[PDB]
Amino acid sequence: FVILDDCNEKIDTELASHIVDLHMKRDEAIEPPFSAEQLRRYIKYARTFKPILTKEARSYLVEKYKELRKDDASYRITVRQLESMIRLSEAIARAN
Amino acid sequence: KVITDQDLAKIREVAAREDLYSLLARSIAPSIYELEDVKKGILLQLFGGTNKTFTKGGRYRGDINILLCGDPSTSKSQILQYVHKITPRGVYTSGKGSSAVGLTAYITLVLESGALVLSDGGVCCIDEFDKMSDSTRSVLHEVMEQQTISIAKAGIITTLNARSSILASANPIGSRYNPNLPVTENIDLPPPLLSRFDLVYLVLDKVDEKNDRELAKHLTNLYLEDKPEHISQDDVLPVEFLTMYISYAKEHIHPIITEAAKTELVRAYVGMRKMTATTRQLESMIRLAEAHAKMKLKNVVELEDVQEAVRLIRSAIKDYATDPKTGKIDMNLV
Ligand SMILES: Nc1ncnc2c1ncn2[C@@H]1O[C@H](COP(=O)(O)OP(=O)(O)NP(=O)(O)O)[C@@H](O)[C@H]1O
Ligand SMILES: [Mg+2]
Numbered sequence: 256f257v258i259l260d261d262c263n264e265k266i267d268t269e270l271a272s273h274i275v276d277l278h279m280k281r282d283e284a285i286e287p288p289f290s291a292e293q294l295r296r297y298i299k300y301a302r303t304f305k306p307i308l309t310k311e312a313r314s315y316l317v318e319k320y321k322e323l324r325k326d327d328a329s330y331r332i333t334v335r336q337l338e339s340m341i342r343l344s345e346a347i348a349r350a351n
Numbered sequence: 352k353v354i355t356d357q358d359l360a361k362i363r364e365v366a367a368r369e370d371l372y373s374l375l376a377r378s379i380a381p382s383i384y385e386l387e388d389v390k391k392g393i394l395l396q397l398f399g400g401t402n403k404t405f406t407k408g409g410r411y412r413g414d415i416n417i418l419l420c421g422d423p424s425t426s427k428s429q430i431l432q433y434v435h436k437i438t439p440r441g442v443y444t445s446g447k448g449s450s451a452v453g454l455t456a457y458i459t460l461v462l463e464s465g466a467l468v469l470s471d472g473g474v475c476c477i478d479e480f481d482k483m484s485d486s487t488r489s490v491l492h493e494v495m496e497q498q499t500i501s502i503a504k505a506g507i508i509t510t511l512n513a514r515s516s517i518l519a520s521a522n523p524i525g526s527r528y529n530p531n532l533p534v535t536e537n538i539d540l541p542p543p544l545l546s547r548f549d550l551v552y553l554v555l556d557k558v559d560e561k562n563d564r565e566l567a568k569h570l571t572n573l574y575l576e577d578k579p580e581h582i583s584q585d586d587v588l589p590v591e592f593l594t595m596y597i598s599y600a601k602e603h604i605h606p607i608i609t610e611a612a613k614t615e616l617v618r619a620y621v622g623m624r625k626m627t628a629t630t631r632q633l634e635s636m637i638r639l640a641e642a643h644a645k646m647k648l649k650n651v652v653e654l655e656d657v658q659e660a661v662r663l664i665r666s667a668i669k670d671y672a673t674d675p676k677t678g679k680i681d682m683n684l685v
Binding site: 260262264267268270271272274275276277278279281282285291 | 403630637
């Protein structure tokens with residue numbers, strides 16, 4: 256992941272407000288979707304799943320990998336990117 | 352170690368004076384001639400911001416870091432002496448005198464403390480900052496940003512607290528300020544480290560007969576007596592009472608942001624940003640405004656405090672005299 260400043264008034268005006276709110280109110284600003292002790296229980300539950308790759312997904316993966324190889328034809332895209340993509344898909348299915 | 356209602360009466364009465372900000376600033380280092388903005392910035396470092404801790408989302412530093420940069424003979428190191436003696440806890444050190452281990456912590460199986468750890472809650476004065484190597488200076492990134500020291504070596508792995516304020520002194524590349532280079536190239540610190548200072552000062556050895564006669568009369572007056580009674584100004588506070596004021600204000604006063612101050616801070620940041628100002632310029636402005644509020648024994652940050660914080664930042668780095676496009680300074684405007 257590469258992070259860059261990308262200066263823009265419409266973003267700066269909001270980001271400054273967010274930062275000043277954090278210094279103005281301690282706890283109140285964030286309002287997260289879930290409690291931390293709720294989220295950890297969910298993550299513990301999710302890690303019990305061991306999902307399996309569907310037939311259509313196997314057909315689809317090689318097409319997407321061919322697209323990456325043609326984009327590649329910047330770090331050069333190897334077989335390892337397919338293995339990594341499978342790992343990410345396993346994690347996504349587990350999240351759900 | 353080396354309260355009464357009368358003390359509180361004196362403190363409250365002094366805090367009501369109109370010339371308070373100038374009185375306090377010119378009284379931290381009485382025998383040093385002018386350099387008022389430098390003295391003001393150092394005073395606000397002494398007071399500090401407010402410390403903040405959340406239930407989640409972390410903790411935010413109250414401490415201010417300052418860098419003094421400019422020509423030789425300008426009396427930078429003399430100012431560091433006063434700060435080193437005023438502060439209750441702190442250390443003075445030199446660039447060629449310091450190793451990475453000595454500055455933080457030492458394996459000896461037992462762990463041992465370095466300068467930034469001994470200086471916790473105080474001010475750490477570093478002189479000849481431009482002489483120490485990139486290897487040694489890289490240690491300061493983590494301690495300045497987080498105020499913690501993480502260690503992972505054979506048989507010991509831990510994290511330590513370092514609520515330490517840095518006051519630094521350096522001379523530019525080429526050893527005298529060169530007006531044919533932009534300011535960032537004269538200062539020559541890398542951007543990840545230069546971004547971590549709240550205030551950066553340029554001080555310049557500009558020739559002027561008006562200035563020179565006053566300076567010469569001031570320094571020669573010290574030799575008219577064996578042990579001088581002479582002092583630069585008629586009204587200054589004794590060191591003991593000044594210490595009492597600063598200590599009490601640090602303990603009892605805790606300012607908060609007002610909505611008006613929030614609006615001005617957002618406006619001012621967008622003004623400096625739209626044109627380079629980073630996100631740290633916002634947080635340092637908040638911290639300076641809080642330090643200004645404590646110094647008046649107020650419980651709230653107001654519009655006046657925000658505007659003083661902005662003004663001092665613009666004044667320190669000679670921005671008004673800076674060419675906005677080329678980054679060089681017109682020496683005629685100084
Ligand atoms: N405004 C001033 N007020 C008082 N003394 C001054 C002033 N300007 C210069 N001096 C004197 O000039 C000398 C400055 O020495 P010093 O404090 O080392 O300056 P410096 O900024 O650290 N220069 P350098 O170490 O070469 O980078 C001391 O003797 C001071 O007393
Ligand atoms: Mg010196």
